[PDB]
Amino acid sequence: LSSNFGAISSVLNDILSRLDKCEAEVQIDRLITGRLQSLQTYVTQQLIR
Amino acid sequence: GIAAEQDRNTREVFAQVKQMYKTPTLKYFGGFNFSQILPDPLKPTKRSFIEDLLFNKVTLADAGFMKQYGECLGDINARDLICAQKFNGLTVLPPLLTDDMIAAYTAALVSGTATAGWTFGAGAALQIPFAMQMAYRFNGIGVTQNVLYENQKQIANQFNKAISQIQESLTTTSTALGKLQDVVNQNAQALNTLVKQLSSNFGAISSVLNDILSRLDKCEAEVQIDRLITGRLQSLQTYVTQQLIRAAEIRASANLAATKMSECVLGQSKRVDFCGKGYHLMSFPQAAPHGVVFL
Amino acid sequence: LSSNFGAISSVLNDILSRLDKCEAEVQIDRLITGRLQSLQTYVTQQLIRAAEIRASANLAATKMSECVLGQSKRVDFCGKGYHLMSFPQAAPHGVVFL
Amino acid sequence: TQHTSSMRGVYYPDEIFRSDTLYLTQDLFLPFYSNVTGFHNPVIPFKDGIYFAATEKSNVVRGWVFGSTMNNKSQSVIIINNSTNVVIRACNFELCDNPFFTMIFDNAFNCTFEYISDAFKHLREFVFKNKDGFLYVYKGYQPIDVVRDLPSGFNTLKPIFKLPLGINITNFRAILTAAAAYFVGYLKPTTFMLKYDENGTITDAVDCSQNPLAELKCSVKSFEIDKGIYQTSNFRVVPSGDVVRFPNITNLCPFGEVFNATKFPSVYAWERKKISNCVADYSVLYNSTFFSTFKCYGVSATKLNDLCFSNVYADSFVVKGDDVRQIAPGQTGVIADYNYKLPCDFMGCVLAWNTRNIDATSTGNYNYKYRYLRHGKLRPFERDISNVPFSPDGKPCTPPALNCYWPLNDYGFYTTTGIGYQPYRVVVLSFELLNAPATVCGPKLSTDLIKNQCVNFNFNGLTGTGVLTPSSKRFQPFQQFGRDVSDFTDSVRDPKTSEILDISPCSFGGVSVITPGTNASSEVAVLYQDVNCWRIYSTGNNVFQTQAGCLIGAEHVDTSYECDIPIGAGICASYHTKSIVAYTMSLGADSSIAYSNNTIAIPTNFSISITTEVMPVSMAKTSVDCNMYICGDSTECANLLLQYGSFCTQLNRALS
Amino acid sequence: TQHTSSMRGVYYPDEIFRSDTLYLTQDLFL
Amino acid sequence: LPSGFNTLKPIFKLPLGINITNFRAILTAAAAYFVGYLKPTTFMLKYDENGTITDAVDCSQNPLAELKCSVKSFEIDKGIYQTSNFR
Amino acid sequence: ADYNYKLPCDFMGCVLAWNTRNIDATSTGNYNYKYRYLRHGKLRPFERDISNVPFSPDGKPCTPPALNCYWPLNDYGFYTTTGIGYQPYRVVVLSFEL
Amino acid sequence: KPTTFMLKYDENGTITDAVDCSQNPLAELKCSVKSFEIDKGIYQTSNFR
Amino acid sequence: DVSDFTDSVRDPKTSEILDISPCSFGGVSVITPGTNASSEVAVLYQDVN
Ligand SMILES: CCCCC/C=C\C/C=C\CCCCCCCC(=O)O
Ligand SMILES: *[C@@H]1O[C@H](CO)[C@@H](O)[C@H](O)[C@H]1NC(C)=O
Ligand SMILES: *[C@@H]1O[C@H](CO)[C@@H](O)[C@H](O)[C@H]1NC(C)=O
Ligand SMILES: *[C@@H]1O[C@H](CO)[C@@H](O)[C@H](O)[C@H]1NC(C)=O
Ligand SMILES: *[C@@H]1O[C@H](CO)[C@@H](O)[C@H](O)[C@H]1NC(C)=O
Ligand SMILES: *[C@@H]1O[C@H](CO)[C@@H](O)[C@H](O)[C@H]1NC(C)=O
Ligand SMILES: *[C@@H]1O[C@H](CO)[C@@H](O)[C@H](O)[C@H]1NC(C)=O
Ligand SMILES: *[C@@H]1O[C@H](CO)[C@@H](O)[C@H](O)[C@H]1NC(C)=O
Ligand SMILES: *[C@@H]1O[C@H](CO)[C@@H](O)[C@H](O)[C@H]1NC(C)=O
Ligand SMILES: *[C@@H]1O[C@H](CO)[C@@H](O)[C@H](O)[C@H]1NC(C)=O
Ligand SMILES: *[C@@H]1O[C@H](CO)[C@@H](O)[C@H](O)[C@H]1NC(C)=O
Ligand SMILES: *[C@@H]1O[C@H](CO)[C@@H](O)[C@H](O)[C@H]1NC(C)=O
Ligand SMILES: *[C@@H]1O[C@H](CO)[C@@H](O)[C@H](O)[C@H]1NC(C)=O
Ligand SMILES: *[C@@H]1O[C@H](CO)[C@@H](O)[C@H](O)[C@H]1NC(C)=O
Ligand SMILES: *[C@@H]1O[C@H](CO)[C@@H](O)[C@H](O)[C@H]1NC(C)=O
Ligand SMILES: *[C@@H]1O[C@H](CO)[C@@H](O)[C@H](O)[C@H]1NC(C)=O
Ligand SMILES: *[C@@H]1O[C@H](CO)[C@@H](O)[C@H](O)[C@H]1NC(C)=O
Ligand SMILES: *[C@@H]1O[C@H](CO)[C@@H](O)[C@H](O)[C@H]1NC(C)=O
């Protein structure tokens, strides 16, 4: 959960603390896709086990 | 590969016998009534009464494999799911074996069991009257055969009553065939999930390719199109992975059905609780939508 | 390994040859995520194939146990007919039973 | 006159060496077995590149002229051989009606480009293409013996010329000497797959749009196909016509009333005007009015003539030169905080121009004001008009006192000041796109409606490809479009006659290709689901209906066998005496045993049989290295990968 | 004086026609 | 105020640019009027075959509505479902 | 950008421009520089149009002393005393591949 | 020199041990698994560079 | 290559063709007992004689 996935930071508080809503919603979407990808990988491994 | 495996599964389960025995004219073998599990030559269908009930219990989705273009353009007010799937590149292929062929296979197996017994699996079929075959089945579980020969009326009546009870149980709406419905529900739900998953924009301006091509030039738009390309490719990959895992589960089930059909219909088994509760005497196969029912 | 995954190029040398470190570290991160995704897909396919091979090997082991070391009563479990004997032979990645 | 180009005219797509690879590319190519026109000297049209072939015995063809108008009024380029050198000259010349051999022209005067080379039974092939102001010429040579037609074969062309001309080329004509023949074909945007040798030479190619077998070859990226049935791409049709539907508007849109007004307000009291029912042709502004800054957000400028705009508002005010940079999203300063603020999700354009000769007088113009004191920032598109004395603590005060100020400052506009203290007029246009009824459109002309046919359409700026049908939906008056569950636009209201139309895709239906091995034959059979035997690529031979679908290219036989190609629904195919045959598969051998109640059958003799059974046990053990696969011998990439280490150890654990 | 708004006051969120769908949205609602 | 369900249609989009914090009604010299306040909320709306909104689900009313909004359906089968954590 | 000089998107190069009021601007007014403001379509990238033919909105040939017939080229009027937005600038565009 | 290290923190937030990831293949293995303790066995490390 | 890796070049001073190859090659395995027992390891290199 500490990977930034090619964004400014891995902390949502830093992005909301420094940018406006505006440039930040496109840095938040990278984190959203990365964490969704991580959950999907976990679910696939669990299905095989 | 998955589709080829599904055809191999059906072939390995149903096509075990090598010669297609004809249905005998007489359905009454020494007190035992075999009419409800064999086809009759007067009704239009090619399958038994129990197979009729089994095919009536399971509801289908496509009911054929032919949806013409003019038919999909004739039903627009009615938002049919199959037209949306076919308009989005998802198609369903027909099975290799028709339901009539599987019904013919099960009819041949039941006729061979009722006429030849157990000997048509080791080699060529050997004819034998049904009472002597019943005597051998009784002798196989440690009971002498005079017990059969002195109580034949009672055993025949109990056999007929049990068949009638199975028929009466299968005429009432229940969840006996509940593990055949889950397969069709999962397949339909997976395709509909891909269709509904097609409205995510994946961090782009819009989820509509027409809006991007309508507003930007080619130039800034080819980098918004590439995000959608990677997202939709990712969605297809997730669908394929789930399908592979489900295919593995179905293949394990089909292997168990094939070995049970081999060891319980073509012979008598000594394994405890492998075929029914009690001492095994016989087994009969019946075809079902995407599956098999053993009696 | 030749997909650029929505970057300027698929060659790391071209990106390091033309941009500075600065704009290039955000083009390199796209390639990093794409190649990591490719490796993950390969590993998932390998796990599923390994499960299939393990099921086949378990069936081969129990057949070797029950048909070479003894005589089996199970119908059609070892050959067509009444089982008398069985002999194992080695094969590339597998076993042949007679 | 009409001949075919049988695998004719392939060239090298780039300047990169490749060997023993198959390369799939998409470019302007001459399609296989396409029509070519023979000439045994009119004006032949030039349609985005040509293939030219000359069959010669006495060197009759000498060069070409390329141009558009072909008179003295536009530029033309001559590429000729005058028997000692090859000279290329792009100039402005008066053409002759009968050019021959030795004057090809009368006079030249506006010459732009010049190039002279060094001084010095046959088939000479050329490819000409025009792209980004460059004329590319490719050349190839082949010794032949034919006398009438273009010979069949395969020959690869090499690049010889890349000329920086910048010329409108739509027409061309050949130059002859006072026998020979020449052939002309046209290039199309097409996907090819090319094969390279071990010497880095192209020796074979596959045209991916020729037939379904070539589509299968391009899909698997191989020249050899094994025996079986393969699901290819679905059935597609290409669009035929064009439909453009725009509202019928007559008035030119009031550029003069907005941009040329005698009085603009101050920035704290900016004014808003609605724009409606107009045609916005900004090309009438190219004669008189010029803008120092013009920057738009939410839409590219090059598409502004192809769209139609829904809710157009124009805001007008006047600022100084240093404040024009503040009229932008996400900006700070006195103007952006206290006078005029823009959102982020802004859609529109901003225009500003210098007005020192109109809004600046000598001695000093003091009629423009701005607010510099406030108790909070403004919200987007919010106006503050009040003039109340300001106190930092927040309580009311009388202006002749202490810590009480007037919140408005004057702009002092002089003639002699620098440009940073000069007045600028600013107009901001804001609108929305493609989600609502619209009445301000571009100058594009409309077209008649076409029903029940795959067309390209343009409805109020929304473009696409599909089939339009009459609909039964009932739109409410404030609605214009309709969408699916997958956000696909499936309904539209026609802006001229208020009827509802349904839009459907053009491609539909699965296609399978049944083939034997590529070594056996190049013949295939095609199975179309979802068609009743129409929507087929071609009516070859033996069309009949099966239970699986419509089968084309196979023969139906009454006898039943085992099958090697499973088609489906009980139908199978094979390769028999040769041709492809289709039949119903056999379930097994017929047998009859008769039931008796008093007879038994007993075996009397026996045989010993030995049966083989093969089973897999293990597979290959493998390992991967993340660092080499992702970042091969790169330190910067390894540093960037350093924070993905948890992901890589999971893969290694799985493999181990 | 005090009453309850029992499923009161829903409006159309945009100007796009939709039929036979369920649409999930986030906006200013009662 | 009577109970029920009724869908409202857009009539006005006025470009005013005004600081609005207070309001007052105007009457004639019986009647009653009711005032409620809007909140940022997630709803799920159902459309007919005529393109009319006839039902809605407020996703923050109770855990059953949270379950309905999670599965995107108006009908829930018998069983136990793991909803979102306590917030 | 529409009628005189247009750049592609996949441009590779650099653009340089500098002010030249002390060289290309004279008193009274320098009228030797021209630009086209009337055309029947937009230019393609790196395409040049040189012709000087009278322009008619309907599209038919006409004689310039008539109605709805214009000359398609306008003069730049370069003075010394004008503001910097009406002063001449020299522009050089370099294009290459890498 | 520019080098990758792995540092260990106490419960008091003090650095008390470190691993130099380029010293020997055992340290490469330790930095790959992010642990100071290795169990008995054979491990495939990075390729020869 | 087939993976778009630049493997050949022409030298611009003398017109000869040169091949470019990577520097890293060959798998390495580390055999270890527990870290409690010893810090000694054995190294197995495939692809070397
Ligand atoms: C001299 C010490 C300054 C210390 C500043 C510390 C951090 C930087 C934060 C704010 C400084 C921004 C100054 C910009 C002034 C407004 C510009 C304008 O008119 O639009
Ligand atoms: C045997 O079954 C058939 C079908 O149910 C029935 O008609 C027949 O009467 C049965 N025979 C006896 C003896 O009950
Ligand atoms: C090619 O020529 C043949 C013969 O004249 C004609 O039938 C066919 O329509 C032509 N095709 C095209 C695309 O011009
Ligand atoms: C152009 O050609 C026409 C006739 O072809 C001639 O009358 C005219 O003088 C020519 N103009 C120039 C500039 O050569
Ligand atoms: C061909 O053209 C070149 C161009 O100047 C000229 O030098 C040469 O003499 C010409 N050759 C003949 C045979 O006229
Ligand atoms: C083109 O020719 C005409 C007449 O010969 C001339 O007036 C004009 O200046 C020329 N164009 C250029 C760019 O020199
Ligand atoms: C010049 O090129 C443009 C760009 O396509 C084209 O529209 C125009 O017709 C060409 N000129 C002539 C005379 O054909
Ligand atoms: C490559 O070129 C050499 C040149 O001597 C030739 O001998 C060889 O046959 C060529 N390779 C092929 C595959 O033709
Ligand atoms: C625009 O305003 C200027 C004032 O500087 C005036 O000269 C010009 O005629 C106006 N334009 C029109 C079309 O009237
Ligand atoms: C452009 O402006 C000039 C200057 O008054 C005028 O003579 C000319 O007619 C205008 N052109 C058009 C097409 O209106
Ligand atoms: C112009 O638009 C109106 C709008 O309804 C329409 O009634 C009318 O038919 C249109 N004019 C033409 C010539 O179609
Ligand atoms: C369409 O196909 C069906 C078989 O599915 C057939 O019965 C019917 O006759 C066909 N339609 C026509 C018009 O022949
Ligand atoms: C049948 O058995 C006899 C001995 O009983 C043997 O000689 C003969 O070979 C057997 N038949 C065959 C076909 O082998
Ligand atoms: C005007 O709007 C601002 C923006 O929120 C607000 O802070 C201020 O209180 C409003 N004015 C009054 C008098 O309430
Ligand atoms: C849709 O509108 C028609 C108008 O005649 C009405 O009859 C129909 O009942 C409506 N549909 C529903 C589901 O109420
Ligand atoms: C942390 O600091 C306290 C200070 O009193 C000390 O007693 C304790 O031992 C320290 N922790 C460790 C792990 O050394
Ligand atoms: C300079 O380049 C030429 C190009 O071939 C080459 O022949 C020559 O050796 C080079 N000079 C030196 C000193 O290497
Ligand atoms: C290389 O290894 C092989 C064993 O694979 C061995 O036979 C051979 O002798 C070795 N080479 C040398 C030079 O010893």
mmCIF file of N, CA, C and O in Angstrom, chain D residues 618-641:
data_model
loop_
_atom_site.group_PDB
_atom_site.id
_atom_site.type_symbol
_atom_site.label_atom_id
_atom_site.label_comp_id
_atom_site.label_asym_id
_atom_site.label_seq_id
_atom_site.Cartn_x
_atom_site.Cartn_y
_atom_site.Cartn_z
ATOM 1 N N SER D 618 5.370 -34.131 -14.733
ATOM 2 C CA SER D 618 5.977 -32.868 -14.339
ATOM 3 C C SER D 618 6.135 -31.979 -15.564
ATOM 4 O O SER D 618 6.020 -32.431 -16.704
ATOM 5 N N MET D 619 6.400 -30.696 -15.318
ATOM 6 C CA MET D 619 6.737 -29.787 -16.406
ATOM 7 C C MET D 619 8.047 -29.069 -16.114
ATOM 8 O O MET D 619 8.739 -29.395 -15.146
ATOM 9 N N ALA D 620 8.393 -28.088 -16.940
ATOM 10 C CA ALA D 620 9.679 -27.416 -16.826
ATOM 11 C C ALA D 620 9.690 -26.409 -15.684
ATOM 12 O O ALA D 620 8.747 -25.634 -15.507
ATOM 13 N N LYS D 621 10.767 -26.432 -14.906
ATOM 14 C CA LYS D 621 10.974 -25.478 -13.828
ATOM 15 C C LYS D 621 11.649 -24.229 -14.380
ATOM 16 O O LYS D 621 12.677 -24.322 -15.056
ATOM 17 N N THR D 622 11.097 -23.065 -14.054
ATOM 18 C CA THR D 622 11.526 -21.814 -14.659
ATOM 19 C C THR D 622 11.700 -20.741 -13.594
ATOM 20 O O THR D 622 11.125 -20.807 -12.506
ATOM 21 N N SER D 623 12.521 -19.749 -13.928
ATOM 22 C CA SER D 623 12.792 -18.617 -13.057
ATOM 23 C C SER D 623 12.937 -17.359 -13.899
ATOM 24 O O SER D 623 13.413 -17.408 -15.037
ATOM 25 N N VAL D 624 12.537 -16.228 -13.319
ATOM 26 C CA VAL D 624 12.627 -14.934 -13.978
ATOM 27 C C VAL D 624 13.445 -13.995 -13.102
ATOM 28 O O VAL D 624 13.587 -14.188 -11.891
ATOM 29 N N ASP D 625 14.007 -12.978 -13.746
ATOM 30 C CA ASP D 625 14.771 -11.917 -13.097
ATOM 31 C C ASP D 625 14.142 -10.578 -13.446
ATOM 32 O O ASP D 625 14.193 -10.157 -14.606
ATOM 33 N N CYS D 626 13.494 -9.946 -12.458
ATOM 34 C CA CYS D 626 12.758 -8.711 -12.708
ATOM 35 C C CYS D 626 13.671 -7.613 -13.229
ATOM 36 O O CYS D 626 13.307 -6.875 -14.154
ATOM 37 N N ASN D 627 14.867 -7.506 -12.646
ATOM 38 C CA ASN D 627 15.772 -6.403 -12.949
ATOM 39 C C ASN D 627 16.223 -6.429 -14.402
ATOM 40 O O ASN D 627 16.290 -5.385 -15.055
ATOM 41 N N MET D 628 16.519 -7.617 -14.933
ATOM 42 C CA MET D 628 16.938 -7.708 -16.327
ATOM 43 C C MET D 628 15.777 -7.626 -17.303
ATOM 44 O O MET D 628 15.953 -7.113 -18.413
ATOM 45 N N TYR D 629 14.602 -8.138 -16.936
ATOM 46 C CA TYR D 629 13.475 -8.066 -17.858
ATOM 47 C C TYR D 629 12.977 -6.638 -18.009
ATOM 48 O O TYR D 629 12.623 -6.213 -19.114
ATOM 49 N N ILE D 630 12.932 -5.888 -16.913
ATOM 50 C CA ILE D 630 12.367 -4.547 -16.951
ATOM 51 C C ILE D 630 13.413 -3.500 -17.307
ATOM 52 O O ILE D 630 13.192 -2.658 -18.180
ATOM 53 N N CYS D 631 14.577 -3.534 -16.662
ATOM 54 C CA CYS D 631 15.595 -2.499 -16.843
ATOM 55 C C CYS D 631 16.943 -3.134 -17.172
ATOM 56 O O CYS D 631 17.781 -3.326 -16.290
ATOM 57 N N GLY D 632 17.160 -3.445 -18.448
ATOM 58 C CA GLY D 632 18.361 -4.150 -18.834
ATOM 59 C C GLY D 632 19.580 -3.250 -18.871
ATOM 60 O O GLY D 632 19.732 -2.443 -19.797
ATOM 61 N N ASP D 633 20.450 -3.399 -17.864
ATOM 62 C CA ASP D 633 21.708 -2.653 -17.744
ATOM 63 C C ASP D 633 21.477 -1.145 -17.744
ATOM 64 O O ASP D 633 22.197 -0.387 -18.398
ATOM 65 N N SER D 634 20.463 -0.704 -17.009
ATOM 66 C CA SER D 634 20.198 0.715 -16.840
ATOM 67 C C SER D 634 20.102 1.025 -15.356
ATOM 68 O O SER D 634 19.338 0.379 -14.633
ATOM 69 N N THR D 635 20.925 1.975 -14.896
ATOM 70 C CA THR D 635 20.977 2.317 -13.476
ATOM 71 C C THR D 635 19.798 3.182 -13.056
ATOM 72 O O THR D 635 19.274 3.025 -11.944
ATOM 73 N N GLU D 636 19.393 4.114 -13.925
ATOM 74 C CA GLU D 636 18.264 4.985 -13.622
ATOM 75 C C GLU D 636 16.970 4.192 -13.513
ATOM 76 O O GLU D 636 16.165 4.416 -12.598
ATOM 77 N N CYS D 637 16.765 3.250 -14.435
ATOM 78 C CA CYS D 637 15.587 2.392 -14.390
ATOM 79 C C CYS D 637 15.598 1.501 -13.156
ATOM 80 O O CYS D 637 14.541 1.218 -12.581
ATOM 81 N N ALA D 638 16.777 1.025 -12.750
ATOM 82 C CA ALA D 638 16.866 0.221 -11.536
ATOM 83 C C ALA D 638 16.517 1.051 -10.307
ATOM 84 O O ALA D 638 15.877 0.549 -9.376
ATOM 85 N N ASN D 639 16.965 2.308 -10.273
ATOM 86 C CA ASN D 639 16.587 3.208 -9.185
ATOM 87 C C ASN D 639 15.083 3.470 -9.162
ATOM 88 O O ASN D 639 14.475 3.545 -8.088
ATOM 89 N N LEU D 640 14.467 3.641 -10.336
ATOM 90 C CA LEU D 640 13.019 3.838 -10.391
ATOM 91 C C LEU D 640 12.237 2.576 -10.045
ATOM 92 O O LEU D 640 11.118 2.670 -9.529
ATOM 93 N N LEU D 641 12.799 1.398 -10.308
ATOM 94 C CA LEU D 641 12.129 0.142 -9.992
ATOM 95 C C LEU D 641 12.212 -0.200 -8.514
ATOM 96 O O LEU D 641 11.419 -1.014 -8.032
#
